[PDB]
Ligand binder design. Structure first.
Ligand SMILES: N[C@@H](CC(=O)O)C(=O)O
Ligand SMILES: N[C@@H](CC(=O)O)C(=O)O
Lengths: 920, 920, 75
């Protein structure tokens, strides 16, 4: 009848909880698990529930003592399941994990903020202590001597651009987030103080039902989804929380402003917040992302957006019942009426006409998507956001003129902000393609023209030629140009950019950029494919050597008159932490990128160019939560200067935007941190620190490279101990290599090692670095410790690695070796595990910590509560990999318990990924 | 800066408040007023705010001491306003009043229920103590020895039919209720314990803004709205609260059932709840309600309903992502797919097809409304509710078959209940017409045929003839029948009933019914106008003499074979409390109707007919709130027998259904009380009581009639002291007479006297009755007191009159006399006021009360808080009536203060009506 | 349930005690009873008075509804 107390007590044995009336995470997990076990019993029988229970207990005992025999006990239960039973159990543990995450969201959403606080930079690393927008304003006036008018001014001119990217292991379906949403809402509401008995009986029932609906929305799908479908799923968070969150956060900004003495509101059309997207735009090493895919996602964006505006304007129309207007609106209303509402309701006549334009904008888009042709003419549709804003501006003005500003400042204002923030699509699409592919197009052209081979030319020649053609008097090539399939694909992409309207797009990112010709090549292609409004061109520098030359590259570009004129004082450059870390190791990349950004800003300053750094995946700003706040504050001085552009990693998007409070705090912290930084850079490092970082980077890079690139048996080891081959072949997303580790892409590199709980890519090299700093001079420990206490960059860098170790378990990696790796390679695995421990030890000593995450007990608890579930998936995954790979491995199967191995593997890969979220 | 405390302290001086953490009404009023005064100042200037403040203080002092000089002080401020200033001030007091009412709704919504209670019938007269559905179940099992299975059974077979009617002084616009809704929601949320500082800053701002939006949604409209427009406005509460409230209440019933040991749910298609409507159907004394109007409202009903189902099914479709179905659904899905979703989502394929049918059903209806013709064929649309239910039943079954009943029992089940409760329209329309109009049609027919004059025939002849024609072999008349306009209008109404589908309609009510021929006449007309499925015919007995003969009338009908066969064991009869009270006075009508219902039930029993009493306006069941609960329990034994049909008076509908909690409790109490009564009738009166009531009724009727019909100067007095002539001429709704008071309609009779705060129609006759009972025999006081303590009917009857006196102020009626009535008629007014006081005194002594509403302090406080505002409107109204009626009356006007007299009068009439709500 | 066999079950456990054990058990139950009474006193001491009440003589039969001295004066 009542097992809720036993589940709760076994959880609390695993976590020494807390008295706080806000700490209820363990209660939430108990309740969710209890309901879930009941469901399992109802659907699959007591015996199956019992088996799930059996596996959980074994995992619990392992997370207690860490006796590795428990993993083999769990193994022998898991390997003895027919594949139908295995699927149900892998699905159970997967679902318990998701539930644990939902519980976490609710806990974070309602945790009390701390009132008394030091106001130093460590407060900015946690949701509970970080500065909200009013606190940041007040800090700037008080501690940095800014007039409120100055703070207001900075804020009006500030942009934060969040760039949405593909979930690496497939995005959750839109209907599943709504279910999740309802589970969270029922969970929140069962603990409200405001309500009675029966309401709770009903919430209990609602929650039970919703845990079940979620579990049975589980269709089994080896064959991937189209990039169009993956884009739709990625766009779900707009309907869920972003659409309302934006106006809600802007209203908070307004209140913060009243409270520091500024009586105005942020203008509705100040572009504080923008969203961009990569989904259907990034084709770098991904030929499923075709020209047609791009054309489609831009149409889908347009369709979704206008569908939202269409539906919202109906609500606005209800509200705008008022009859008093200025004469300017009167005139307009009467015109429209003369060409189905009364004229005594003038706002409704205007908004009704906007509604039809929006309906038209939406049907035109759908037609073009389904057929290429629409009977709906462009004249009857919105093609620029200002056409849509104008009549809304007219309403606003008319209301204020009549004395009803207060009304204008409600729903109408929310709407102006939505329109202005989201514009006609909800996101602008970046295109990304690798520079070789541009070279190939250009070599096809030069060879056709019989003037030689662009590939063979030196860099000085490439520039000389590209500039001569960018002011050429004469087109380069036609349709009759002989093209490989790949070259046709690059050209057809540019033709899409020419055809489609410029408000669909943002950046053309060049992967593997290294020279000025890389950027000039794209400028020429765009001009020659007749892109009337060329996308800005953004180089992505990947390797350490490429980051070293980046500054000179940008100096050259800027000193070219054509390009300088063309760029109109703005340039964006992209960095990719995971990418650079794959080349030199994480530590060395972190340092190089700090320096790279200082150096590129210096060069921009010199040429009078405004420089925007676009943060790609793997940086500490990608963590989400409080840690994102300190991460922003820790950027090098002047590297934001009013413009934050940052990747929202798909594996972090739910946590960041799925729950409405969290979404609000995410937007808040991006605005707060950006504003503060531009007026309050972090401390610049001491010379001694720089010098030590340079020495440490050399050593760190040497360790990492000698293991990852010069150990001849490394790739072999990697392919056995890691599910990277099976991630590739069951392709979850893109496709894994472009050869060895040079050839492998960042995401698969991280994912392979996250799946084994070993995380090599995040920590390798730090151990050599610290060890060597300290042997060289024992005083370096103190300096390292001081850097941790007082240099934000360094704090933040260590904290991310510390978090990754909290998600680590070398016991799991050892089990994979035992099962999957040949005995000859075992000492190699064991030395890599010795390196993990040694690296971890040094990290703890530098942070002044006895255990992992001592500074962040809330995060410690969250991670520890996930581990029981993830661990079962890991053991299941290891033995499933053994069965797939080795046909001659068999065990006695149990008789079927409930009422394909590849399917199990897909399920465990996604679960472990849902559990590990962000690492590097 | 802070006047909130002065407003609050001046209110609390007027009401000696309470410590209860739930009693916040006075705080709510303070806050709402403070924000409102600020708005007035911003929009109209300090001086205008000051004037409103000045008028409020004078009204406050009057409600304190009741010095009548204060009314003249207020008068002299009000009469000195140019008409533009007068409009703004009347609008201010009107808006403050509405605000006071919103505050009240919130107070009632969140007041704590009382846990310990006597469980006697007085507990059922208040929201805080009344029985909910679980308590009623438990009472029936425990105190009446019913098995839960029996209780379940009674409930499955029970119907409650709430019949929506026209607001007597015009329905609030749909957009204004939404605003109201938002003001309430902001008010509730400012006192939530669950939230922080800034949230409140924002709610403050939201509330201020919404009070302003409401104030400026105020267009000035002498020219009435069409009956179609008045029907649309009446239907607003479906979107607001009823649409969700129904499934929500049915789910509560399910929980109550689990909790008394019944594991089933009420079947989704048990018709526990139904709504009907009169709007566009009642034409009795109202020629604006034409055949075309009726045709229209049935189309609008159909349109609205299908628009709601269409929009809701989209949500349901999102939820129904599941892939497991039974084979029956599989087959169907694949068929539909073969004729735009994947087939792996079978519920969505079914629901999508339902969605298109719903869209079609909705466009067909709109076309027919706008043009008479639709290209959309009937085959592609729903014409019967079962066509719509079938595919939903299929989903339900399929889910249960696959083990997912728990899922079926969520949103799908809510939807089945909505569909089944609301059906294809949301309401079925009654038609009502007066019996003379039928006689005229029949006389036109007999004269045409040259067989004499139906009007001239006796009742025995009329029946003989109507029965001969109802089994006639030969049609009565054609199109070439010569018709007056009125006769054509009655025929064309029947032709509408023939053309339109039978699910649009319910009852054909015959006003002024008195004989069996009245009912047989309509049966014949329906047959001869070719109504394939005739509406049931329902007689409305109005006069005392008509109620006396009603039983014999029904005995005759039932003993006629044709009619008996035709009626298939069911008959509805309607009673109209206000109507009968206009003929004989309220007391005498109350008693007659108790007896009438006993007698008609007796006759039905004898003939084996199931009898449904339809309660028209003015009864104690129309009060709303707790009092509706005891009122139902107090019906005579066996007079409900599983079927409650009751009028929801337009002047009570906001209070009953505007706020979601109140809507839920309204549905609850109708179900609770109906179920209990059928198993637990009230005590039948003692013989001594009957005898005393008969003696008291004679005397009560004689007093009332001698004043209202035999005093030759009464009508003259009535037309001077009352705004009834101006209610008529500025027609707010219907139109006032059909002559004298016989000729005047109930609603205008009540409204005239409610506007003067005198309420003559509710209390007159009670005084003579009680006085005479007590002089005859001093022991009668004790018996009267005992009847009050132990006979529910009597309690409830006195309580309604007591409530009306709480809304009374003879000081106001005296002011009207002084200003509007000629001096010769002043002693007449003064004797009527002497009668008020004497009647009130006796009422207090019988109830054992020292002051009005001592038994109901919550209601006492609510009424007292309204009075300040209503009183200002009353004084304004009195002097405005003086100006309209007397051109030679003038006063010095103030210079204009802010930055038509008929308009002011409309405004004061509506305000006083919004303030007085229900009386008789 | 009021199954009378339970009294004899209890009997057979109680009659089988040496007199030293019997004393200690009778003393335990005696003390548990006193404890129960102390708990009752605390419950009655802090139970909330009921604000809304009929003001008839039945209210005077319970601590929670009876009239205090001010209510009696006012009455
Ligand atoms: N997003 C969290 C980690 C997690 O939730 O797994 C962080 O970066 O600290
Ligand atoms: N509806 C309330 C009266 C009112 O709210 O004015 C009642 O009948 O008691």
């Amino acid at each position: 009848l009542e097992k809720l107390a036993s589940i709760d007590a076994q959880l609390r044995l695993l976590v020494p909880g807390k008295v706080s009336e806000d700490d209820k995470l363990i209660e939430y997990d108990a309740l969710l698990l209890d309901k879930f076990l009941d469901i399992l019993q109802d659907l699959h029988g007591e015996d199956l529930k019992e088996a799930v229970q059996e596996c959980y207990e074994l995992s619990a005992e392992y997370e207690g003592k860490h006796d590795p025999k428990k993993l083999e006990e769990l193994g022998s239960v898991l390997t003895s399941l027919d594949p139908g039973d295995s699927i149900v159990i892998a699905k159970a543990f997967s679902h318990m994990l998701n539930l644990a995450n939902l519980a976490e969201e609710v806990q974070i959403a309602y945790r009390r903020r701390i009132k008394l606080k030091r106001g130093d930079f460590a407060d900015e690393a946690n949701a509970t202590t970080e500065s909200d927008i009013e606190e940041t304003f007040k800090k700037l006036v008080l501690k940095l001597n800014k007039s409120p008018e100055e703070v207001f001014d900075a804020l009006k001119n500030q942009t934060v651009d969040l760039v949405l990217t593909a979930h690496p292991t497939q995005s959750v379906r839109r209907s599943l987030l709504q279910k999740h949403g309802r589970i969270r809402n029922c969970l929140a509401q069962l603990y409200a103080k405001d309500i009675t008995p029966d309401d709770k009986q009903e919430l209990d029932e609602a929650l039970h039902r919703e845990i079940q609906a979620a579990f049975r929305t589980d269709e089994i799908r080896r064959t991937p989804p189209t990039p169009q479908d993956e884009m739709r799923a990625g766009m779900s968070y707009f309907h869920e929380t972003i659409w309302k969150g934006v106006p809600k956060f802007l209203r908070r900004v307004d209140t913060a402003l009243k409270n520091i003495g500024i009586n105005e509101r942020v203008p509705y059309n100040a572009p504080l917040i923008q969203f961009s997207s990569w989904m259907g735009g990034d084709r770098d090493g991904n030929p499923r992302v075709t020209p047609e895919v791009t054309r489609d996602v831009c149409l889908l964006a347009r369709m979704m957006a206008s569908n939202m505006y269409f539906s919202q304007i109906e609500d606005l129309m209800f509200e705008m019942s008022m009859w008093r207007c200025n004469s300017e609106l009167r005139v307009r209303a009467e015109e429209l009426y003369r060409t189905q509402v009364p004229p005594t309701e003038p706002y409704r006549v205007i908004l009704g006409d906007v509604r039809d334009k929006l309906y038209n904008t939406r049907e035109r888009s759908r037609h073009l998507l389904a057929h290429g042709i629409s009977d709906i003419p462009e004249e009857a549709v919105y093609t620029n956001v200002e056409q849509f804003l104008e009549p809304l501006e007219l309403c606003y003005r008319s209301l204020c003129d009549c004395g009803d500003r207060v009304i204008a400042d409600g729903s109408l204002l929310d709407f102006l902000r939505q329109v202005s923030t989201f514009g006609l699509s909800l996101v602008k699409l970046d295109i990304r393609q690798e520079s070789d592919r541009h070279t190939d197009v250009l070599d096809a052209i030069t060879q056709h023209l019989e003037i030689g081979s662009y590939r063979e030319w030196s860099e000085e020649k490439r520039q000389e030629w590209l500039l001569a053609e960018l002011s050429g008097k004469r087109p380069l090539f036609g349709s009759d140009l002989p093209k490989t399939e790949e070259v046709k694909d690059v050209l057809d992409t540019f033709n899409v950019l020419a055809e489609l309207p410029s408000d669909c797009f943002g950046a053309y990112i060049i992967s593997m950029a290294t020279s000025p010709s890389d950027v000039l090549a794209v400028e020429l292609l765009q001009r020659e494919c007749h892109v009337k409004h060329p996308l800005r061109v953004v180089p992505l520098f990947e390797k350490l050597a490429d980051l070293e030359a980046a500054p000179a590259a940008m100096a050259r570009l800027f000193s070219i008159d054509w390009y300088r004129n063309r760029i109109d004082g703005k340039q964006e450059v992209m960095i990719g932490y995971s990418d650079s870390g794959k080349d030199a190791g994480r530590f060395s990349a972190a340092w190089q990128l700090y320096k790279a950004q200082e150096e590129i800003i210096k060069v921009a300053k010199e040429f009078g160019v405004k420089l925007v750094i676009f943060h790609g995946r793997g940086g500490t700003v990608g963590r989400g939560g409080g840690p994102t706040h300190l991460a922003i504050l820790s950027q090098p001085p002047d590297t934001i200067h009013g413009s934050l552009r940052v990747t929202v990693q798909g594996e972090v998007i739910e946590q960041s935007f799925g729950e409405e409070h969290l979404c609000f705090r995410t937007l808040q912290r991006f605005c707060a941190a950006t504003l503060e930084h531009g007026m309050n850079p972090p401390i610049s490092p001491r010379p001694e620190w720089r010098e030590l970082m340079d020495q440490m980077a050399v050593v760190a890079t040497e360790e990492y490279r000698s293991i990852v690139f010069k150990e001849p048996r490394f790739v072999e080891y990697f392919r056995l101990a890691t599910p990277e081959l099976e991630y590739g072949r069951m392709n979850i997303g893109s496709r894994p290599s472009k050869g060895g580790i040079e050839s492998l892409r960042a995401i698969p590199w991280i994912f392979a090692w996250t799946q084994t709980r070993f995380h090599l890519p995040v920590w390798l090299g730090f151990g050599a670095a610290f060890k060597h700093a300290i042997k060289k001079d024992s005083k370096n420990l103190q300096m390292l410790q001081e850097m941790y206490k007082t240099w934000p960059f360094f704090r933040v860098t260590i904290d991310l690695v510390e978090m990754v170790f909290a998600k680590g378990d070398p016991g799991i990696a050892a089990l994979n070796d035992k099962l999957l790796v040949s005995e000859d390679l075992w000492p190699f695995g064991e030395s890599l595990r010795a390196n993990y421990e040694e690296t971890k030890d040094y990290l703890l000593k530098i942070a002044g910590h006895r255990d992992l995450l001592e500074g962040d007990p809330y995060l410690k608890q969250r991670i520890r509560l996930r581990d029981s579930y993830i661990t079962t998936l890991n053991v299941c995954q290891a033995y499933t990999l053994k069965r797939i790979r080795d046909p001659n491995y068999h065990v006695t199967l149990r008789p079927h318990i409930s009422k394909g191995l590849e399917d199990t593997l897909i399920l465990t890969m996604k679960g472990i990924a849902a559990g590990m979220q962000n690492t590097g």
